[PDB]
Design a protein around this ligand. Structure first.
Ligand SMILES: [Zn+2]
Ligand SMILES: [Zn+2]
Ligand SMILES: [Zn+2]
Ligand SMILES: [Zn+2]
Ligand SMILES: [Zn+2]
Lengths: 71, 264
């Protein structure tokens, strides 16, 4: 469903720049990474589609869950 | 209450020489590290769990237990509570990325990730690769997914080449039945009934590859405290190359870490 990470191509180091690509399609920025060229966002299906078609965007992947490995 | 695990990896060999992890910064990326603990020293930390702002409150118990095991191996290490999992023990890939990036920015020496997922993330791979490129020793639990015939069951981020993947043995050096397997497995450490610190000033036993990983993170801290100029590459190589062979490498990797041999 709704939680994603959006990977960017070069030249989008600034959070304002990443956020513009996301917010203009109506997505909501959750966090811009510092070293990784990506940002977390909440996105509806249309936003995901438009992002996958945006030349700025390297990938859109689910922001999946990782868990403590105690048994 | 201290894991039998400390002696099993030969950590007291380093302590006997006068090295206990002094000045080494270890980031514990977990559910926080509880402030309730009299002995547990925590140098600092930060939370990346939106609904849980205090990295010094551990509402799960995992992070405090892992932290205690690091210090049991390396009593003088500086621990940082990097809260990337919430009370239920889960966290989003992006929270974990935020913790790794915090560790890089704050010049941590060692990252411990006693966490896993069956699937990877390109952004998480980028994060761990960047941490290793910047010189950080990155250690993860291999996973608790047992066997699946001939298939790898190693979880991410342990499955990424840049990350040391740590399986679990018991006090007899037998692989724990839950311990994940595969060619990505690097080394083993004690992970069955490990006694360590729990929230509320408690002590108690837990099992899992989450318990094995901190023995290797602490081992890395011991080695760096003796050899502050060795690179992460050199630390990793030392631990892998000098491990005690324990059986078939699909199940045991290079075998059990031996910090005595590694810190030559
Ligand atoms: Zn000792
Ligand atoms: Zn205590
Ligand atoms: Zn690996
Ligand atoms: Zn040296
Ligand atoms: Zn075999």
């Amino acid at each position: 469903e709704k939680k994603y990470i959006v990977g960017f191509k070069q030249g989008f180091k600034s959070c304002a720049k990443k956020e513009d690509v996301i917010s203009e399609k109506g997505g909501k920025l959750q966090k811009c990474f510092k070293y990784v060229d990506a940002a977390s966002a909440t996105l509806n299906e249309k936003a995901v589609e438009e992002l996958k078609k945006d030349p700025s965007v390297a990938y859109v992947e689910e922001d999946k869950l990782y868990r403590a490995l105690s048994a | 209450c201290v894991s039998y695990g400390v002696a099993q990896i030969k950590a007291p060999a380093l302590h006997s020489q006068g090295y206990t992890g002094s000045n080494v910064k270890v980031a514990v990326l977990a559910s926080g590290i509880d402030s309730s603990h009299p002995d547990l020293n925590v140098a600092g930390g930060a939370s990346f769990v939106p609904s849980e702002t205090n990295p010094f409150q551990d509402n799960n118990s995992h992070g405090t237990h892992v932290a205690g095991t690091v210090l049991a191996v390396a009593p003088s290490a500086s621990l940082y509570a990097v809260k990337v999992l919430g009370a239920d023990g889960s966290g989003q890939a992006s929270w974990i990325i935020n913790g790794i990036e915090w560790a890089i920015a704050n010049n941590m020496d060692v990252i411990n990730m006693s966490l896993g997922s069956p699937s990877g993330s390109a952004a998480l791979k980028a994060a761990v690769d960047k941490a290793v490129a910047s010189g950080v020793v990155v250690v993860a639990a291999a996973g608790n997914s047992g066997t699946s015939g001939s298939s790898s069951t190693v979880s991410y981020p342990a499955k990424y080449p840049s990350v040391i993947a740590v399986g679990a043995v018991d006090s007899s050096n037998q692989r724990a039945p839950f311990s994940s397997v595969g060619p990505e497995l690097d080394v083993m450490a004690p992970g069955v009934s490990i006694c360590s610190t729990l929230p509320g000033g408690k002590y108690g036993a837990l099992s899992g590859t989450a318990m094995a990983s901190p023995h290797v993170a602490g081992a890395a801290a011991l080695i760096l405290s003796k050899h502050p100029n060795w690179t992460n590459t050199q630390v990793r190589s030392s631990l892998e190359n000098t491990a005690t062979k324990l059986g078939d490498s699909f199940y045991y990797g290079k075998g059990l870490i031996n910090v005595e041999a590694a810190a030559q």
